[PDB]
Design a protein around this ligand. Structure first.
Ligand SMILES: C[n+]1cn([C@@H]2O[C@H](COP(=O)(O)OP(=O)(O)OP(=O)(O)OC[C@H]3O[C@@H](n4cnc5c(N)ncnc54)[C@H](O)[C@@H]3O)[C@@H](O)[C@H]2O)c2nc(N)[nH]c(=O)c21
Ligand SMILES: C[n+]1cn([C@@H]2O[C@H](COP(=O)(O)OP(=O)(O)O)[C@@H](O)[C@H]2O)c2nc(N)[nH]c(=O)c21
Ligand SMILES: Nc1ncnc2c1ncn2[C@@H]1O[C@H](CSCC[C@H](N)C(=O)O)[C@@H](O)[C@H]1O
Ligand SMILES: [Zn+2]
Ligand SMILES: [Zn+2]
Lengths: 299, 119
């Protein structure tokens, strides 16, 4: 077993991000292979546990009364395994809102059912998790081009509803990806494509934006970066591993009591950007959290 | 009164379903945890001990899983947004266990599965 087998997963190394590859078909040596999970543990509980274990190594902003929204939280089982893990991970009292096209029962404080495009809120968020995936993505007939659908909503939601200092983890696959989302990763202090060790046999990755700066820090070409991601996955086989699931002693997200402040866009100087970049600051108002689901009225 | 008088009793109906050999409700969400917890019945975070499994609350609630009103004037759920501890021996049917057992208001342990307030 490689050194990375005791980690929750593997992040895309920096040198792979600096290449200029052309998009190629993803061909994983262990494609489809299933991980050996602890008895009675669901694949999505293991996956979200490894994602959270990896987010524990980043400079996430963790303010009092933290605000987290989880898109694609429903399953064909009618329950929300990922939401259960996020609520276990997040400090007690964290407001957790989840959503899905299909009905499901959740541990979230509030749940909105319907297309993500019907979800509205004037409030800003500290962390956005998306596990959305369109089943039709499996129908690979044309060339692998940038996908719209929920990715268009996610990009707009990050641009309009993510607090400065906030972070995101957005699920992508070989065919479920968006060039603008990769370009947006350049608006964070840091970013990566993270692969869980339990799903090492899938092209799935979480695109993680760490500490939103609300302005481009580096220029990223989305088509080129996705090609770079596939080149990395095609040349670096990851061995399936559930080893990190057995040690949950340091699992809960550390309560950092990160400062929350209100600031005009003209007040965002280099000293403020420096605080955002270290997870020591969240910029947003601390108003009541109000969310709504657009309802189409028909006969 | 006529709607209330008529209403369901989903609780007893589940024991009757199990009594007739009905397959227990599946997909209760089992959490990964240290198994060195307090062992209390319903907690804000997984508290399973060496003899228990911790599950996401909503997924172990008959009323939540069957999309039917909760037996309370406020329709308040005691499991949703929390974690329920289930003895490993009964972990195959968490919905059945939460229904058939009650929590001790004093120590927070399951009566007959951890509560020793009576010596
Ligand atoms: C990476 N890859 C993709 N394909 C082909 O391309 C298609 C589309 O590829 P994809 O973008 O869906 O990626 P991949 O196959 O890696 O995704 P995977 O099925 O592992 O799904 C990843 C995650 O997405 C979610 N998901 C997948 N399918 C669904 C679904 N129907 N509904 C909901 N969520 C889903 C789940 O969370 C799941 O864990 C595949 O269905 C397959 O024919 C491959 N074929 C070979 N031979 N070798 C490969 O390495 C390979
Ligand atoms: C995980 N991470 C990596 N970086 C940046 O990347 C550098 C090194 O990245 P690394 O992968 O942590 O390498 P190392 O620990 O072996 O040196 C850091 O010093 C930061 O500049 C990061 N920068 C920020 N702001 N936040 C993070 O969580 C973060
Ligand atoms: N446009 C859209 N709006 C909302 N949800 C969407 C969507 N497109 C796909 N989804 C949802 O994305 C989900 C992918 S599977 C999600 C699994 C879940 N995170 C878990 O913890 O098990 C599906 O439930 C699907 O309904
Ligand atoms: Zn309930
Ligand atoms: Zn007692």
């Amino acid at each position: 077993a490689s050194s990375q087998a005791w980690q929750p997963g593997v992040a895309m190394p920096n040198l792979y991000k600096m290449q200029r590859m052309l998009l190629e078909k993803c061909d994983l040596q262990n494609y489809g292979d299933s991980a050996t999970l602890p008895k009675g543990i669901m694949m999505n509980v293991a996956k979200y546990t490894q994602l959270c274990q990896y987010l524990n190594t980043l400079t996430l902003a963790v303010p009092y009364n933290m605000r987290v929204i989880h898109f694609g939280a429903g399953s064909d089982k009618g329950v929300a395994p990922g939401t259960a893990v996020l609520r276990q991970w997040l400090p007690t009292g964290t407001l957790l809102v989840d959503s899905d096209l299909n009905d499901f029962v959740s541990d979230a404080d509030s749940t909105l059912i319907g297309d993500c495009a019907t979800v509205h809120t004037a409030n800003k968020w500290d962390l956005i998790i998306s596990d959305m995936y369109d089943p039709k993505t499996k129908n690979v007939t044309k060339e692998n081009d940038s996908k719209e659908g929920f990715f268009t909503y996610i990009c707009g939601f990050i641009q309009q509803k993510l607090a400065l200092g906030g972070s995101v983890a957005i699920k992508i696959t070989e065919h479920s990806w968006n060039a603008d989302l990769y370009k947006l990763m350049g608006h964070f202090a840091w970013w990566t494509a993270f692969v869980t060790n339990v799903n090492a046999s899938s092209s799935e990755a979480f695109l993680i934006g760490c500490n939103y700066l609300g302005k481009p820090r580096e220029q990223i070409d989305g088509y080129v970066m996705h090609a770079n991601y596939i080149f990395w996955r095609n040349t670096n086989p990851i061995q399936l591993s559930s080893y990190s699931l057995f040690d949950m002693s340091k699992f809960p997200l550390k309560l950092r009591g990160t400062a929350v402040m209100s600031l005009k866009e003209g007040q965002i100087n280099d000293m403020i950007l420096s605080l955002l970049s270290k997870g020591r600051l969240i910029i947003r108002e601390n108003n009541r959290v109000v969310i709504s689901s657009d309802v189409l009225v028909n006969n | 009164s006529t709607v209330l008088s008529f209403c369901v009793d989903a609780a007893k109906a589940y024991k009757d379903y199990l009594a007739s050999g009905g397959q227990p409700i599946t997909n209760c969400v089992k959490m990964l945890c240290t198994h060195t917890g307090t062992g209390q019945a319903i907690t804000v975070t997984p508290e399973a001990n060496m003899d228990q499994e911790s599950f996401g609350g909503a997924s172990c609630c008959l009323y939540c899983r069957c999309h039917i009103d909760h037996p309370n004037p406020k329709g308040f759920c005691d499991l949703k947004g929390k974690y329920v501890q289930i003895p490993t021996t009964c972990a195959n049917d968490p919905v059945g266990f939460t229904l058939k057992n009650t929590v001790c208001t004093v120590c927070g342990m399951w009566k007959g599965y951890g509560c020793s307030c009576d010596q």
